[PDB]
């Protein structure tokens, strides 16, 4: 897999060349589908290698959910140095995979026939997507995972074609997805940044390193945060805030070029606070009006092969909407709140207006890009500051 775009144009894409996505080399000056919708869809599941079978996973079954948790806990995304691996919790997986409109056939697992061991997965969830001047019903593809023992055996293309087929059956012909690798063809390239909250732990586990000309004592003083937030009237989101949070989000997102279009029910799902999954804080001013909100989701990572430190607790910036409170103040309170809740690090991408605060609030640039992709949709690429979509 290629990490740089120039390194990717020396690569040949035996699978992606067959798919309705623009070629890495071509420049896109149009807006529309790569190919027309299909009006007959293959009725049969694609064939897996001998000894493996499809199984749609009922994540409402606690045992099955735990099998998926374990597949991902052991085989999902790692950093470049193979030191850290995402550790999505079972309850977080339910949040990410059963939003409004979720469909059981879109939780697409692969099992070993004999042992029944879960060795593969891919998911779709439905989402209405605004892309430049077009609003489309699409799916979001996530959690593509092949067991380490099954890798480099052409299994991932089968998972992709099978989820494509199952989405086609429901009348949907576009998708959005993100990858750390460069593929044909990014609509936008974002960059993770990191804000230390427990610098000591981060250094001991080699998530970060001491800056060249400063000491540990200095690093700790540099990243120290207030004990409590400063914004007047900041509080956790409640049921009564669902409408205004939907209103605020909907109006705020119009300024970007790739955004979700959430119903009020989707807003309830994605923002209503759930401990250790999603945090949302609103600003209720002196008149009782909600004028801003901040939000971040919980995603720890396994620290691989470490005898003492086993896990790294990370907060991920979600959607932050400002209309009366400065964004910089909002995000400082996010950092303070994440520190209070025990997070070790606060991550955020350089999309939306995030570049206006990343350096000022002492974020450090990461080593990983997050590429954004559309399936079967041709449009011009956009800068990170025009991406207004955050995926789990």
């Amino acid at each position: 897999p290629a990490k740089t775009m120039e390194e990717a144009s020396k690569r040949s894409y035996q699978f992606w060349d067959t798919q309705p996505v623009p070629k890495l080399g071509e420049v896109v000056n149009t807006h529309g589908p790569v190919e027309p919708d299909k009006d007959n869809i293959r009725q049969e599941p694609y064939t897996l290698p001998q000894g493996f079978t499809w199984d749609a996973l009922d994540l409402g079954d606690r045992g099955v959910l735990k099998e998926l948790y374990t597949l991902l806990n052991e085989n999902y995304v790692e950093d470049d140095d193979n030191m850290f691996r995402f550790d999505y919790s079972p309850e977080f997986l339910l949040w990410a995979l059963r939003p409004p409109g979720w469909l059981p056939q879109w939780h697409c697992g692969v099992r070993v026939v004999s042992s029944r061991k879960l060795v593969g997965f891919i998911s779709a969830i439905p989402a209405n997507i605004h892309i430049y001047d077009t609003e489309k019903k699409m799916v979001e593809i996530n959690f593509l995972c092949v067991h380490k023992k099954l890798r480099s055996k052409r299994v991932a293309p089968v998972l992709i074609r099978e989820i494509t087929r199952r989405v086609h059956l429901e009348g949907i012909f576009q998708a959005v997805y993100t990858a750390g690798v460069v593929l044909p063809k990014p609509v936008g390239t974002c960059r993770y940044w990191h804000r230390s909250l427990n610098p000591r732990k981060l250094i001991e586990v080699k998530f970060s390193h001491l800056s060249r000309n400063m000491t540990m004592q200095r690093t700790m003083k540099l990243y120290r945060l207030p004990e409590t937030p400063k914004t007047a009237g900041l509080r956790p989101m409640e049921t009564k805030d669902i409408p205004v949070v939907h209103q605020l989000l909907t109006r705020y997102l119009k300024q970007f070029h790739l955004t979700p279009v959430m119903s009020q029910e989707e807003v309830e799902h994605w923002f209503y606070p759930q401990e250790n999954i999603i945090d949302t804080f609103v600003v209720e001013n002196a008149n009782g009006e909600v004028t801003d909100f901040l939000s971040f989701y919980t995603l720890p990572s396994t620290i691989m092969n470490h005898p003492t430190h086993k896990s790294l607790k990370a907060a991920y910036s979600f959607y932050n909407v400002h209309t009366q409170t400065p964004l910089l103040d909002l995000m400082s309170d996010a950092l303070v709140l994440a520190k209070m809740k025990g997070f070790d690090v606060f991550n955020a991408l350089d999309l939306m207006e995030n570049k206006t605060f990343l350096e000022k609030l002492k974020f450090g640039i990461g080593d990983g890009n997050l590429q954004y992709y559309l399936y079967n949709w041709k449009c011009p690429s956009m800068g990170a500051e025009k991406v207004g979509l955050v995926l789990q």
Binding site: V77, T178, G180, H194, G368, L370, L391
Partner: peptide
């Protein structure tokens, strides 16, 4: 993400 980043 679909990418585990660390400070460069």
């Amino acid at each position: 993400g679909k990418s585990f980043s660390k400070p460069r």
